[PDB]
Amino acid sequence: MLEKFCNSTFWNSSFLDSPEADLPLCFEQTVLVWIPLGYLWLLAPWQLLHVYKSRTKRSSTTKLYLAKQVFVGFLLILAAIELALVLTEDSGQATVPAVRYTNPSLYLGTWLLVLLIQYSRQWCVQKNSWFLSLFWILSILCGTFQFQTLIRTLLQGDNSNLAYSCLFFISYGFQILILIFSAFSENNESSNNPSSIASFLSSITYSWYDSIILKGYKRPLTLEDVWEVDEEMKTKTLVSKFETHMKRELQKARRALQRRQEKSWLMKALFKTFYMVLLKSFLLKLVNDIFTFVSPQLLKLLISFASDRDTYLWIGYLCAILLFTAALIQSFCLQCYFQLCFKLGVKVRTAIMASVYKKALTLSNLARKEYTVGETVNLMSVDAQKLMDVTNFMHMLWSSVLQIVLSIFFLWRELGPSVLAGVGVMVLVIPINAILSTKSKTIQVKNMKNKDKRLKIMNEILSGIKILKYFAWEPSFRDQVQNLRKKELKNLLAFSQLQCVVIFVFQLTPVLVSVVTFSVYVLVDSNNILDAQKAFTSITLFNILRFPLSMLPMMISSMLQASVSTERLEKYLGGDDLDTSAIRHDCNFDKAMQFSEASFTWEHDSEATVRDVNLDIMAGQLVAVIGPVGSGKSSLISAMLGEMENVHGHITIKGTTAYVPQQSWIQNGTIKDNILFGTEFNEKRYQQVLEACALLPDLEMLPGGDLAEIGEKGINLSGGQKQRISLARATYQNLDIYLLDDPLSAVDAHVGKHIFNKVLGPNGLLKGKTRLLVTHSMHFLPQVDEIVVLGNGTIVEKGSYSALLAKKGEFAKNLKTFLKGQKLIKKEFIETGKVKFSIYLEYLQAIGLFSIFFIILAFVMNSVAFIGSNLWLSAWTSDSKIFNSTDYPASQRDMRVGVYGALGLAQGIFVFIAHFWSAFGFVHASNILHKQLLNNILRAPMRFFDTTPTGRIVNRFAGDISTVDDTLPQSLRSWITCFLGIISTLVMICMATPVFTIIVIPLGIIYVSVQMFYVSTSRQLRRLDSVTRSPIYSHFSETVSGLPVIRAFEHQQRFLKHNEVRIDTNQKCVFSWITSNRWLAIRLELVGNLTVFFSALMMVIYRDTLSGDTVGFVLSNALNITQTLNWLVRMTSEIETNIVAVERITEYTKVENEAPWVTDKRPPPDWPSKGKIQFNNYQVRYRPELDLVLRGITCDIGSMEKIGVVGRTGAGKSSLTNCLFRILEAAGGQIIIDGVDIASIGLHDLREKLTIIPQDPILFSGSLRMNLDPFNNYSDEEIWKALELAHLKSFVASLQLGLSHEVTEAGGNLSIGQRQLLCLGRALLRKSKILVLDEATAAVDLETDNLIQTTIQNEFAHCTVITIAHRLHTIMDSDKVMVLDNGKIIECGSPEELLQIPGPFYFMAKEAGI
Length: 1410
Ligand SMILES: Nc1ncnc2c1ncn2[C@@H]1O[C@H](COP(=O)(O)OP(=O)(O)OP(=O)(O)O)[C@@H](O)[C@H]1O
Ligand SMILES: Nc1ncnc2c1ncn2[C@@H]1O[C@H](COP(=O)(O)OP(=O)(O)O)[C@@H](O)[C@H]1O
Ligand SMILES: [Mg+2]
What we know:
Elements: H1 3-6, H2 13-16, H3 25-32, H4 35-53, H5 63-89, H6 98-120, H7 130-156, H8 162-184, H9 200-203, H10 210-218, H11 235-261, H12 266-273, H13 276-307, H14 313-348, H15 351-362, H16 365-368, H17 373-393, H18 396-411, H19 419-463, H20 466-470, H21 474-506, H22 509-523, H23 546-573, E1 583-584, E2 593-601, E3 610-617, E4 622-626, H24 633-640, E5 645-646, E6 650-653, E7 657-660, H25 671-676, H26 683-692, H27 696-701, H28 720-733, E8 737-741, H29 749-760, E9 770-774, E10 786-790, E11 795-799, H30 801-806, H31 810-818, H32 837-846, H33 849-877, H34 879-882, H35 894-937, H36 942-947, H37 950-960, H38 963-992, H39 1000-1018, H40 1020-1027, H41 1030-1041, H42 1044-1049, H43 1052-1101, H44 1109-1138, H45 1140-1148, E12 1173-1180, E13 1190-1197, E14 1203-1206, H46 1213-1220, E15 1228-1233, E16 1236-1237, E17 1250-1253, H47 1264-1268, H48 1276-1285, H49 1289-1294, H50 1312-1326, E18 1330-1334, H51 1342-1352, E19 1360-1364, E20 1376-1381, E21 1384-1389, H52 1391-1396, H53 1400-1408
Adenosine-5'-diphosphate binds near residues 701, 1183, 1209 and 1210.
Membrane topology: Multi-pass membrane protein
InterPro entries: AAA+_ATPase, ABC1_TM_dom, ABC1_TM_sf, ABC_transporter-like_ATP-bd, ABC_transporter-like_CS, ABC_transporter_C-like, MRP, P-loop_NTPase
Main location: membrane
């Protein structure tokens, strides 16, 4: 076409048929100089404009940058002179073909652009992008063909082409130099991470990750030695991006449901929000797949060259290079694809793991009755994680099937219509695989549903634990948690067995089709025999389809888990949120709040707890609502906050709100943080609140004073202390409306007077702010501006103090009845060196040592079958040479195929059995870990719980113990299979050759060397993964713990930031993991392809003698052992990582323990008979690193002596009771009860004969029956008697589903008043001779307090009672009274005597008001 262009031809095929074959010279300067050149022009404007569109800040002129420009500049002048040389020496009479014109001119106009693109590239963040960098490689490789041909003409004989030839070398020569300066070097001061700053050629070999790995080897990594993830995927960006799509999809589904009602969206949302990252991988999968069939063909071209002799070295060496470059690009394309999916995996496990938290804030109370802090954790940890694993294998759906057909395509060359039956079995898998899937999903959904029921009934155990220690309920809860565990393993095992059948069928399809296809070929059309060449020629790679079908069986397994996990996220994120419509949050209102005939019900179909409410409060007032227990006080406050759901009414409020919940909620951290609540610190106001609210005395004894770390849910403080913090927090915030729901019940009388006048009084801090109040004590009624007596959700009366008492009624009689050591939580201790081998042995011991032997036996006894199969082919391929077409019989040689078929099945069964003992072996093993950890974490001393947040423990039961169930058991199977793959392959070679197997020796070291170099960097990026995951659950529980407080101050936006930051601290340590895994594949596969290429060259250089099948035997095996070793160094680093999970689970199995529950010494059956209690200078210390909280207490209590104790807040009143139950060890002294030592006997020989009513009411989810008797050892008839005494029958009777009611977490259903009475109900059942009362009247009215008091002094006449109290009203009745301060008992005697003598009790008496 262009022969005239150069006075030559395109390509004379005669040239390429010679041994010393050369590409045509004109050909090169026509297309080989166009292909790279068309690259720039055809694409440069896009890149050139692309960067300028996103113009960034100016660029610092780097030292290296000029080197790039000047060298390219040389290419401009270099190409320039030759153009002049064309016209300077060949312009007159010299025939000048167009090539002499275009060759420099096009380059001259091209290199000029290179300057600009290389210049404009400065302003971009990435200094050496893919575009320019690929040009050099695409040019140098293409330009290489020119280099060689110039040598040939030049070397064989000098010519006149030095004018252009010599110059060309320099032009090409710099290109090599430019690449090194350009494609590799990277440097800049920005972004605090190489991830975004690395030359393209160095960003596909992950050379920029060398820094982390080298750090790991020299020392253990740390949370500060990993770079924060790039802004492309930062939780803030993801949530904002994902949400806008989720909202639209949710609406469409929401409007969709309207159609069905009057008579399935999540997976859509995720796809619609990740267009590119899915599409980009897809187009990057086909390229990988294409190169999957380039390599095998190249091997065939090599064998043909090897077997043949007349072939030229030209086709020989050239094939070897392509065997390297073709595979080399495959590694870059593949790994560049995996790291493009896992990113999508860790990028969808943050949208879900963040959206789940967000929805937790806005879920209506109705929905939260279903989910819990426990269930949502499972949704956050396991379900989200299972939704990240699918992305790894998400693309096998169509990639595999495409490979199958393409593999079939090659095989249909040999076979015609016979293969129709062959595909018949391959399609007979589809319905078999379908039925199992259906029977596999229904068994999966049961597992998750039963996994939640475990955490829910166990998260509550951790939250309320002191109860479990007080009453010996560990056996009961220890006996029903496993009962839920068994209900799961019975299901996980079944789901594991089904994974054996699916695995079995796929490992049997390839061999089954082989047998059937041959039979049909003989059945119908036997006119041709194929000369037995079907043995290996048609089956040389017929089994290549195994790898496709070897990754699938576990792939489908993952998709069922994802298909089920994503079904729950839908149910969660779809939960209806609370409605603020009924609460008209106006801004300009004459009054403060308007109740316009409102009526609110807790749940949809129920009687409203607020009925016909109609009330108005002026812009400044002090309203003090009052009434009987369970009358709607707290609900009315919650109604305004929007928690309740309105029916037939509306509410209006002007301004903001402040809330003080009845059940005080305290965050974790310093006191300052709790009071500040995130607002700017102001010293001036801070001192006012601390002084105004009686906190200074409380700050004295706390170790660190102000900065004294407070324990989750306020373990340190107790009652009065907690309430002061809650009250101060609202006062400091300085809002408009204050809603105080019983804020000062816990505190004593003297403090309460101080609190009211200074803080809430008419001249207090809240002088002008409106302030609703809910008081159970009639003390402050005279000072109230208005009162609202409400009973059963109705305003029975409403008037000022004087106005109400004027009318004779309940209120009139209501009054008449009245008249450094500061740090607790410590950082997780992460093992540094390496997983001690004792951990592996422990896990292996859990598995049956009988089973492991058989499991290994089956696999090794499997591989032998695999060895025989291939060995059979070798003994079968030789048949053709000895026999002939006519001499080969059929009746006697059908055994050859028969053996292969039967032998093929033997391998299929043999692996199936191995996978089966695995299920029993592993499931049982996972059972003995949980049964040990749970049986030990229920015996740790209270000390362990106080310091360790609930986040740590709950994590080891969802995040980790799940790994031992799903991931670790699977990996331990792959490793065994790979290892026996190595042994099988080595035996094959060993038989073939005596001592040439020694090739393994160098290769083994090269692989073992790198593996040992990399494990110590992936292991330390897995402990960090599970060590920075604990705070997520810790914080999440803290949020849901007290929700109403947050929504009262509208501080939601700040809380999002925390969880939005904690996740970013956990992504940083998991994204850096997957990259740390890709870096292994590249810098390992490169060693693989290099080994094959080195063998390939070695083969050709000795082609003269070495020849025959040996070339195929060595290349095929050299390309096989290098595969498994690659597939065995990754797996052996996968068990070495995942086994970290077992290390953490084993960590808590070895924590300290309390004294044995039951010891050899058994107290006499009727040990507690009288009630003697003797204290002998007892000393107590909460933690070893603290001073004696109780200092040398000595006292005695007579039999049946009604005894009470009084003292200042935090004077050991509560601690003294915690000593009887041996919750703390005897630091000094001793105690004897009924003449029996307490430290001598076991804990459960004691705590079953003592009763205590903790100040805090803790309840467990489920029916009231369990919360009153979890042992289930008590009849129902006696329960009613027990409840009746506690004056709780009336409320229970009203509940239609009374006895078998349902109780949410921590008794959310029941008011704090009812919880205390119910918690007192437990005490009635035991009827033990000893009964401790701990502020049981804090959350009860006076009349009800008398009623319960009446029983305790009437129906309990044969049991010593130690009543700890703050109010004195219920202490004069006690026979004796004790006064203790600073852990020192002061007074002891009857109330009358202490009053006669002036002293500490006397002033307490006078100040008490009596
Ligand atoms: N979160 C809840 N879910 C369902 N029912 C609830 C809830 N909170 C309270 N109730 C029901 O409302 C009634 C209690 O009313 P409310 O919670 O307003 O009492 P309260 O002011 O806390 O009482 P008290 O003064 O006795 O402490 C009882 O029927 C209780 O079962
Ligand atoms: N979880 C805890 N860990 C360590 N010390 C505690 C804890 N709880 C309370 N204390 C100590 O108890 C003392 C006050 O006694 P306390 O238990 O508050 O009696 P009461 O609760 O009846 O007021 C404080 O000095 C405090 O240091
Ligand atoms: Mg209440």
